[PDB]
Amino acid sequence: MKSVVTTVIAAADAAGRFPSSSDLESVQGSIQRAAARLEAAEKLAGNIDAVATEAYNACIKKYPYLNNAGEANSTDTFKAKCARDIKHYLRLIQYCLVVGGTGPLDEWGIAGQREVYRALGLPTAPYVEALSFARNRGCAPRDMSAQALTEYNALLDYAINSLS
Amino acid sequence: MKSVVTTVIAAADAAGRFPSSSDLESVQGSIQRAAARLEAAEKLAGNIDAVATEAYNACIKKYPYLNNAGEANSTDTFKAKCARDIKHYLRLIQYCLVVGGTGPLDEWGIAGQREVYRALGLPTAPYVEALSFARNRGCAPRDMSAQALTEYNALLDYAINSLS
Amino acid sequence: MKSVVTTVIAAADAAGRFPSSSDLESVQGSIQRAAARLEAAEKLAGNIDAVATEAYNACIKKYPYLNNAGEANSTDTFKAKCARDIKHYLRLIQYCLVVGGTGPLDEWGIAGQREVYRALGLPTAPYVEALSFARNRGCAPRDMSAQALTEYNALLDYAINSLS
Amino acid sequence: MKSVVTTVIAAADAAGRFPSSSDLESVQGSIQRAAARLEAAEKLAGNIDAVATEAYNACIKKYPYLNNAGEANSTDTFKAKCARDIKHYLRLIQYCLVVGGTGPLDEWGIAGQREVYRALGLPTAPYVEALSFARNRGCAPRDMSAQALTEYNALLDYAINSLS
Amino acid sequence: MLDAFSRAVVSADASTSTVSDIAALRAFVASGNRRLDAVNAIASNASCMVSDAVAGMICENQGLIQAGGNCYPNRRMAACLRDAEIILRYVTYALLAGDASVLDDRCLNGLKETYAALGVPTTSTVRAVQIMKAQAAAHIQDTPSEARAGAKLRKMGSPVVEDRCASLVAEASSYFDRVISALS
Amino acid sequence: MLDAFSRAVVSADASTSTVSDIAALRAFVASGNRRLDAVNAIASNASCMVSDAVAGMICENQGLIQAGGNCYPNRRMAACLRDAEIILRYVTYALLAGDASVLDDRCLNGLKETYAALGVPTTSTVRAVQIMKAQAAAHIQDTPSEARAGAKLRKMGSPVVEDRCASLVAEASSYFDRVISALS
Amino acid sequence: MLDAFSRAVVSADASTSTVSDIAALRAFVASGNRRLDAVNAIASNASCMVSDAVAGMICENQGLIQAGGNCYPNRRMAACLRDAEIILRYVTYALLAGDASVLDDRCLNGLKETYAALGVPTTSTVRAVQIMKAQAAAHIQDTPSEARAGAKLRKMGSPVVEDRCASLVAEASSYFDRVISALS
Amino acid sequence: MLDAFSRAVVSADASTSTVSDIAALRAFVASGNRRLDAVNAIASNASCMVSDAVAGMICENQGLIQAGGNCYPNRRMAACLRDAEIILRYVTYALLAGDASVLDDRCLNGLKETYAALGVPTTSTVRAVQIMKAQAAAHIQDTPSEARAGAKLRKMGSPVVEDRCASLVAEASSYFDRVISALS
Numbered sequence A, B, C, D: 001m002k003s004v005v006t007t008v009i010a011a012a013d014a015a016g017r018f019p020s021s022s023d024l025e026s027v028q029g030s031i032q033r034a035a036a037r038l039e040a041a042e043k044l045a046g047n048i049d050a051v052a053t054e055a056y057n058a059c060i061k062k063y064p065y066l067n068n069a070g071e072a073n074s075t076d077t078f079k080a081k082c083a084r085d086i087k088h089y090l091r092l093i094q095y096c097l098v099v100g101g102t103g104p105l106d107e108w109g110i111a112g113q114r115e116v117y118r119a120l121g122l123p124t125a126p127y128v129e130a131l132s133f134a135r136n137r138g139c140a141p142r143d144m145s146a147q148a149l150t151e152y153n154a155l156l157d158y159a160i161n162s163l164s
Numbered sequence E, F, G, H: 001m002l003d004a005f006s007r008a009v010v011s012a013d014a015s016t017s018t019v020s021d022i023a024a025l026r027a028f029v030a031s032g033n034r035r036l037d038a039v040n041a042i043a044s045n046a047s048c049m050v051s052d053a054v055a056g057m058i059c060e061n062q063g064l065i066q067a068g069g070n071c072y073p074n075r076r077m078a079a080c081l082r083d084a085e086i087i088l089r090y091v092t093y094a095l096l097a098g099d100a101s102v103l104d105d106r107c108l109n110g111l112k113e114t115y116a117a118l119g120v121p122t123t124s125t126v127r128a129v130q131i132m133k134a135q136a137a138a139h140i141q142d143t144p145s146e147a148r149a150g151a152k153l154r155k156m157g158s159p160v161v162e163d164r165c166a167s168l169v170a171e172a173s174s175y176f177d178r179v180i181s182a183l184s
């Protein structure tokens, strides 16, 4: 699961090395940055349902054709699954803020996403619009500190990039 | 040349990745630690001859047999080469403090050291004693700040470990 | 370029074999089937613009949101590129009917299609609808013989499968 | 076991492909050619003993030295084994006509034939003469249709080539 | 590969000397946070940059998507989008390291000869890299125009100074210029 | 590799056009059975052709089997028999496909440079290929002479026409001529 | 270089034999006048063929005359017109000689590598050569269309036969196909 | 591998829940500096620890260096010094990560079966690991005895608290105990 410490340990292990100067130095970066990303993680844990709901509502507002018979937002099951999927991405982003790396998003969200959406004829654009809405929504210090919001925005942009 | 930033770039490159959350976070560690290790690097640059000389004198004091005809400290050339070698190790440690990694010591000091010393019948014990003396010599805040001296001591212990 | 004859030659070459009983027998299949698929190839060459135009019109009729400002069918350039893309797929299908294999569609249409559409935010559904319309449109003997239309329909289904 | 259908399936499987246009087209060739080769297979099944006997008699007529003490046709056991071997090749040719490929001859006759004959000091020339006699013997429409005899002759030439 | 600091070490080792200009190294460290903002601005917007740069190259030269053009057919357009992303990735590595070594050694070494052998137009590639250089400059300064971005506009919200990291913009631009020099 | 049909497709794709000359493709199909007879005539007689061609090369140039000759010792004679069979195999592939691509790409590309590096005489190789070209012509026409075959004479029994597949003979001969051109 | 007759001599010299197939040589001589008509038809219309072929390549791929295109600027358009004329010249030499040696040795040897080194698109070049191949076929047959010629239409007035020199058309076409093969 | 934080994520994902206990994560971060001191204390003294631990195992069981003993001859003593260093390396990784995953997955999985197959005594190995566990405890607390160190004594100079990182000592000891459990 990619994080600061798993990256330096994997590089140390590939070369048969004990932790050295650069390994500890890297982890000092986590000690400095954790406050910002744990602030974001706590805000997102506290308010994920509201954040996910407004992102879901944004993507359906942009693509109302999804409501037409046979389209991806057209039944109660589809509507519930779509909103669930947005919450899945935000939960994986909460996990990345806890860990300080893309590992959880890489392994549990992004890997296979394109094969799944292609196989079920789910358009990618609504997913991108939902995340893009969430990316443009936040401001500091209203929602959280500038560095907390920077961390949150970077992980949203990372998910957006994975679908683009 | 192993450092915080070359390690995360090499791991990113192996996976075809842009720099991500954990890569920037790792480099924040360098931003926090640089003051301490650049303090050590500047002290060592300023006083390397005195530091190397007293380490050389310590290893000959421990192993006076090196002064006997045919032994490794017995001629003016040998004496000059031995003192030069201790200064080489300290210069490579200065480089490691600048870079925040073992790269310079790995590539320019440690690789081949045992083949060379074995081939010329140079005993390793005096090298270890010189570095070990240097490792035990420093104290904070006399010589430099506690964290500067921690970084210096870790690189001396790294060199010592490579010879042990 | 995958065809009956290139497939048996590639398998013969991998084993260091002269053409043998099964190789000539395979090519006899092409001699029997060529009339049907060359009938389809000639019809498609004769009428490709009309066939492509009605498939393009079908996909825009299904997804009129594509006409809205900023969407994939919203400018004269976009409209022309979309219609061009449908004609590209039909031209590659004409090539497959000439060759008696998926080679031309494999190498010139399908390889990279998903990377391109993802990168430009082109939804795949309209491509699938255009080909799906073309697949359901034809009937024998009106358009061509039953076996000609079987060959045409199989290559449309192959393209559809590649996008699904 | 090499045939039209096993060749196209093996090539499909190596590339992870469903059967496609060129695979079905290849099998249409088997549907057209089967009548000729099953006619040959049925004639050979019906008359293999007479066909094998006259080929055996031809090769001993060409190489009567084989009858001398210590040579390969010199005892009752040797005579019976030699005639049996000719019938083995003709049975494998019957199998190739059934299958529409060299598979049975490749796997059960040709693989190891040279190691066996070398190890037992069996000259190859009599085997070649027997098959060569069988190859030159047949005519259409007396023995079977022209295409049936073409199939039979091609498999005899294939066995001859394997020993040459 | 080297970074800005190991570059100073390699320069010093040419005279087996200690690194004495610690002031310059302290200056690198003091611009550390803005450097991380600059890398974050490119990485966060990389897909928008690549698709816009390759689309721009194509809207200026329509032959790339016509018979015999090197973004035709689908396979070649995909390969070209991949190469623009690769080049941008190595430029972002260079900016994170403060040194071109990784770009020079892992991306540019033999690139022209590879493109010559494949028939990839170096002219059109240079134009794609020019557009990415302009995009990168705007994203580092956090001044992308609505005219070029439309609904895809992004703001990073880095703390603003009057010069808007002119020094990092010049550095980033010099890495894109090494790509252009390597293909010219 | 290409066959005659994918050759027409690649030519058409140079102007992103449909293949319009379906009459020529129908002509290829109408000669399909005689083409299969032509491939069967070579494959069925390949061992006789190779041994006769290499033996012919040698009976015209005795130095190949004397001190310093390139069919001396046993290992080199074996390697040369192998190469004559390989060349004949790629020519039969080209005839089955109705296109030289497989011969050009998998056999002739770098052959001269390989032979130069090994000291294999291209002159004597050209003579072996000349004899195989003559053998192939006779077997396609089903007119091998008893004078050149003796007891090894074979008849294919293909249905005879006046021209004896002159067009297939010319095509087969043009593939052997590509080998000769590649070594000359 | 070789011509059709010295080609027969070089083939015979591979077995140090006399040329015995005088009938084939007499057949070459009997088509001598029509061969001179075929060369005259190309040489006499060469400027119209080159400008129409290069203009055709360009109207099918507009990128050649846009930023970064290889017929931009004036110097490159001029260089390309020169190359189309050179290729057509070597093809006409081959047709006059009845042998590709002069085309192979003096024009095609290293052409692909030169074009790779310069960034000249081989795809677009192949299209120019395709058009010249079609033009040459029509001029040899003395059947150029008014649709493609307009006021530039030329009639040679060679003595007509029903086949319109099909064999010379195929030969000329095979030389253009060697150019395309050399660049493909 | 997991670290302490991705361990919390994996636990939460078992109920597809967000990680809500941020207080525990803040507690991990607050002990970050002392954790880095603990890893530095082991890595900096690893050679002294390995040689003293293996020498200790041997001075308690002299059979390891007698006929049929598993540190006899030179090759086996070297292999054993290597294994003690490897085990200590994976324990230091686990302490740096705050999670045993890397130790369990990359070092302990199949270790007993490997040792069974080689004839490596698990008893004597457990003794080497016991000594390294005691050494690690002392170096983390910065209280190595002069009695066991002599002239090799090292002081780390970490800032002292009354408990001397009792919680990190227990954690480190639990990783050594996983090794012992895996071999017992």
Ligand SMILES: *C(=C)C1=C(C)[C@@H](Cc2[nH]c(/C=C3N=C(/C=C4\NC(=O)[C@H](C)[C@H]4[C@@H](*)C)C(C)=C\3CCC(=O)O)c(CCC(=O)O)c2C)NC1=O
Residues within 6 Å of the ligand: E045, E048, E049, E052, E053, E055, E056, E057, E059, E060, E130, E131, E134, E135, E136, E138, E139, E143, E144, E145, E147, E148, E149, E152, E153, E154
């Ligand atoms: C084709 C008709 C055509 C194009 C396609 C387009 C290409 C182009 N783009 C620029 C400059 C920029 N584009 C940018 C891209 C983005 N801005 C954003 O906010 C999002 C995230 C992202 C993706 C859409 C940016 C940042 C720039 C920099 C300048 C600016 O912001 O205004 C250019 C200019 C190239 C140059 O200066 O040499 C071009 C040509 N243009 C077309 O004509």
Ligand SMILES: *C(=C)C1=C(C)[C@@H](Cc2[nH]c(/C=C3N=C(/C=C4\NC(=O)[C@H](C)[C@H]4[C@@H](*)C)C(C)=C\3CCC(=O)O)c(CCC(=O)O)c2C)NC1=O
Residues within 6 Å of the ligand: F045, F048, F049, F052, F053, F055, F056, F057, F059, F060, F130, F131, F134, F135, F136, F138, F139, F143, F144, F145, F147, F148, F149, F152, F153, F154
């Ligand atoms: C050495 C003294 C010497 C030779 C050895 C021989 C080589 C040679 N062979 C030909 C022509 C042919 N040989 C053929 C071979 C076969 N015919 C058959 O029926 C069997 C199956 C097969 C193997 C024996 C064939 C078919 C030909 C074609 C012509 C024909 O049939 O008559 C040549 C002539 C080469 C040329 O024309 O350039 C040569 C030289 N000749 C020797 O002198």
Ligand SMILES: *C(=C)C1=C(C)[C@@H](Cc2[nH]c(/C=C3N=C(/C=C4\NC(=O)[C@H](C)[C@H]4[C@@H](*)C)C(C)=C\3CCC(=O)O)c(CCC(=O)O)c2C)NC1=O
Residues within 6 Å of the ligand: G045, G048, G049, G052, G053, G055, G056, G057, G059, G060, G130, G131, G134, G135, G136, G138, G139, G143, G144, G145, G146, G148, G149, G152, G153, G154
């Ligand atoms: C772009 C808009 C464009 C072109 C430019 C043009 C190119 C083109 N030309 C041909 C075919 C021919 N052109 C010929 C030229 C001439 N005929 C004459 O009588 C004079 C002397 C000379 C100069 C004008 C000829 C002879 C031909 C051969 C065919 C014919 O006569 O009809 C093509 C056809 C290419 C092909 O078949 O592959 C092309 C594309 N076309 C354009 O679109």
Ligand SMILES: *C(=C)C1=C(C)[C@@H](Cc2[nH]c(/C=C3N=C(/C=C4\NC(=O)[C@H](C)[C@H]4[C@@H](*)C)C(C)=C\3CCC(=O)O)c(CCC(=O)O)c2C)NC1=O
Residues within 6 Å of the ligand: H045, H048, H049, H052, H053, H055, H056, H057, H059, H060, H130, H131, H134, H135, H136, H138, H139, H143, H144, H145, H146, H147, H148, H149, H150, H152, H153, H154
């Ligand atoms: C055989 C005669 C024999 C031994 C060999 C020796 C082994 C042994 N060592 C310990 C405990 C420690 N040794 C330590 C090692 C070091 N101290 C340092 O400062 C340097 C860097 C390093 C190498 C010399 C340390 C730190 C300890 C921990 C305790 C302490 O410091 O006093 C043990 C005890 C293990 C246990 O308690 O089970 C043993 C057995 N002993 C021998 O008898």
Ligand SMILES: *[C@@H](C)[C@H]1/C(=C/C2=NC(=C\c3[nH]c(C[C@H]4NC(=O)C(C=C)=C4C)c(C)c3CCC(=O)O)/C(CCC(=O)O)=C2C)NC(=O)[C@@H]1C
Residues within 6 Å of the ligand: A033, A147, A150, B024, B025, B028, E030, E031, E033, E034, E035, E036, E037, E038, E040, E140, E141, E142, E158, E159, E160, E161, E162, E163, E164, E165, E168
């Ligand atoms: C040009 C690049 C920019 C710009 C950047 C500035 N950012 C400054 C400070 C700053 N940035 C960060 C975020 C950064 N640090 C990290 O550790 C990480 C991620 C791991 C990132 C992305 C921080 C934490 C800080 C410091 C806190 C603060 O000062 O707010 C900065 C101010 C300091 C300086 O002058 O360098 C600048 C200038 N500013 C510009 O005008 C353009 C848009």
Ligand SMILES: *[C@@H](C)[C@H]1/C(=C/C2=NC(=C\c3[nH]c(C[C@H]4NC(=O)C(C=C)=C4C)c(C)c3CCC(=O)O)/C(CCC(=O)O)=C2C)NC(=O)[C@@H]1C
Residues within 6 Å of the ligand: C024, C025, C028, D033, D147, D150, F030, F031, F033, F034, F035, F036, F037, F038, F040, F140, F141, F142, F158, F159, F160, F161, F162, F163, F164, F165, F168
């Ligand atoms: C020059 C090559 C020959 C020649 C060949 C002819 N054969 C003709 C027809 C024909 N051949 C076959 C056998 C072929 N078809 C297959 O499917 C397979 C194997 C899988 C093979 C080997 C068949 C079945 C047929 C068609 C039936 C028939 O017509 O008898 C043929 C006649 C048709 C035509 O004009 O092309 C010719 C000319 N003829 C010659 O004179 C030389 C020796």
Ligand SMILES: *[C@@H](C)[C@H]1/C(=C/C2=NC(=C\c3[nH]c(C[C@H]4NC(=O)C(C=C)=C4C)c(C)c3CCC(=O)O)/C(CCC(=O)O)=C2C)NC(=O)[C@@H]1C
Residues within 6 Å of the ligand: G030, G031, G032, G033, G034, G035, G036, G037, G038, G040, G140, G141, G142, G158, G159, G160, G161, G162, G163, G164, G165, G168
């Ligand atoms: C395809 C090439 C043509 C075609 C050509 C024919 N020309 C024929 C005969 C012929 N041509 C010339 C002129 C030629 N001989 C020269 O010495 C020179 C210049 C120095 C040239 C350009 C002559 C003198 C003759 C012979 C006199 C005559 O027959 O009028 C010809 C007829 C003979 C034959 O069948 O080869 C042909 C076919 N005919 C065609 O249909 C296309 C357009």
Ligand SMILES: *[C@@H](C)[C@H]1/C(=C/C2=NC(=C\c3[nH]c(C[C@H]4NC(=O)C(C=C)=C4C)c(C)c3CCC(=O)O)/C(CCC(=O)O)=C2C)NC(=O)[C@@H]1C
Residues within 6 Å of the ligand: A024, A025, A028, B033, B147, B150, H030, H031, H032, H033, H034, H035, H036, H037, H038, H040, H140, H141, H142, H158, H159, H160, H161, H162, H163, H164, H165, H168
């Ligand atoms: C048990 C492990 C020790 C012990 C450790 C403590 N260290 C404390 C503070 C501290 N240590 C460092 C160095 C460390 N941080 C890094 O970034 C790196 C390398 C990159 C290392 C090696 C720092 C920077 C600090 C913080 C500054 C300071 O407090 O001086 C510490 C105090 C904080 C706390 O209570 O957690 C402790 C306890 N102390 C002990 O008693 C044993 C010997």
Ligand SMILES: *[C@H](C)[C@H]1/C(=C/C2=NC(=C\c3[nH]c(C[C@H]4NC(=O)C(C=C)=C4C)c(C)c3CCC(=O)O)/C(CCC(=O)O)=C2C)NC(=O)[C@@H]1C
Residues within 6 Å of the ligand: A043, A044, A047, A050, A051, A054, A137, A138, A139, A140, A142, A143
């Ligand atoms: C700065 C003032 C901005 C701006 C901010 C506003 N956001 C408003 C409401 C709002 N924002 C969110 C997402 C936010 N809450 C979270 O929990 C997280 C992440 C954990 C984020 C990023 C939500 C869910 C809501 C609705 C509930 C609420 O009222 O907080 C908001 C209120 C107006 C509105 O609802 O549109 C403002 C003003 N608005 C701006 O234009 C500047 C640039």
Ligand SMILES: *[C@H](C)[C@H]1/C(=C/C2=NC(=C\c3[nH]c(C[C@H]4NC(=O)C(C=C)=C4C)c(C)c3CCC(=O)O)/C(CCC(=O)O)=C2C)NC(=O)[C@@H]1C
Residues within 6 Å of the ligand: B040, B043, B044, B047, B050, B051, B054, B137, B138, B139, B140, B142, B143
């Ligand atoms: C803490 C108070 C120690 C201690 C320190 C002493 N070291 C003495 C002199 C000395 N130390 C060095 C090495 C030092 N100089 C550097 O530039 C660096 C690092 C870059 C280091 C580690 C040198 C070269 C010297 C001689 C020059 C000088 O006087 O500064 C020293 C003076 C008396 C003596 O020589 O022993 C002391 C007191 N001594 C202790 O007992 C505690 C534990």
Ligand SMILES: *[C@H](C)[C@H]1/C(=C/C2=NC(=C\c3[nH]c(C[C@H]4NC(=O)C(C=C)=C4C)c(C)c3CCC(=O)O)/C(CCC(=O)O)=C2C)NC(=O)[C@@H]1C
Residues within 6 Å of the ligand: C040, C043, C044, C047, C050, C051, C054, C137, C138, C139, C140, C142, C143
């Ligand atoms: C069987 C009777 C069907 C059916 C057929 C209809 N299609 C109509 C027109 C039409 N179809 C195409 C596609 C067709 N043209 C081609 O060239 C090819 C293949 C190469 C295909 C598959 C086109 C382009 C057109 C328009 C031109 C034309 O009229 O031929 C059609 C006419 C009425 C209408 O537009 O619906 C019919 C009746 N319709 C059916 O209901 C059955 C099941």
Ligand SMILES: *[C@H](C)[C@H]1/C(=C/C2=NC(=C\c3[nH]c(C[C@H]4NC(=O)C(C=C)=C4C)c(C)c3CCC(=O)O)/C(CCC(=O)O)=C2C)NC(=O)[C@@H]1C
Residues within 6 Å of the ligand: E054, E064, E069, E070, E071, E075, E076, E077, E079, E080, E081, E083, E084, E086, E087, E106, E107, E111, E114, E118, E120, E121, E122, E124, E125, E128
């Ligand atoms: C886009 C701006 C171009 C363009 C690009 C094409 N590149 C093609 C393939 C290709 N690219 C490279 C270099 C690339 N690979 C690397 O690993 C690195 C650096 C680490 C880079 C920068 C290679 C080695 C290859 C060959 C491998 C392959 O074919 O995938 C390519 C396909 C060429 C072809 O096969 O025909 C294209 C089209 N094309 C354009 O027209 C613009 C200017």
Ligand SMILES: *[C@H](C)[C@H]1/C(=C/C2=NC(=C\c3[nH]c(C[C@H]4NC(=O)C(C=C)=C4C)c(C)c3CCC(=O)O)/C(CCC(=O)O)=C2C)NC(=O)[C@@H]1C
Residues within 6 Å of the ligand: F054, F064, F069, F070, F071, F075, F076, F077, F079, F080, F081, F083, F084, F086, F087, F106, F107, F111, F114, F118, F120, F121, F122, F124, F125, F128
């Ligand atoms: C026979 C007509 C020649 C002759 C031939 C020799 N070739 C020798 C080896 C050899 N041949 C090739 C090319 C060949 N290998 C392929 O894979 C292909 C095409 C796919 C072909 C056409 C290679 C690469 C090699 C080297 C490998 C090896 O040595 O087995 C050869 C042996 C040379 C040596 O090692 O001394 C010979 C003698 N020799 C003659 O004199 C006539 C003219």
Ligand SMILES: *[C@H](C)[C@H]1/C(=C/C2=NC(=C\c3[nH]c(C[C@H]4NC(=O)C(C=C)=C4C)c(C)c3CCC(=O)O)/C(CCC(=O)O)=C2C)NC(=O)[C@@H]1C
Residues within 6 Å of the ligand: G054, G064, G069, G070, G071, G075, G076, G077, G079, G080, G081, G083, G084, G086, G087, G106, G107, G111, G114, G118, G120, G121, G122, G124, G125, G128
């Ligand atoms: C036109 C169909 C092309 C195209 C052609 C260009 N060729 C350029 C220069 C060039 N061409 C050659 C080969 C040519 N010279 C010979 O002597 C022979 C044969 C005997 C041939 C066929 C050479 C050696 C050169 C380089 C030296 C020179 O300038 O003459 C060229 C200019 C390249 C440059 O300097 O950038 C062009 C543009 N360009 C096209 O876009 C179409 C496809």
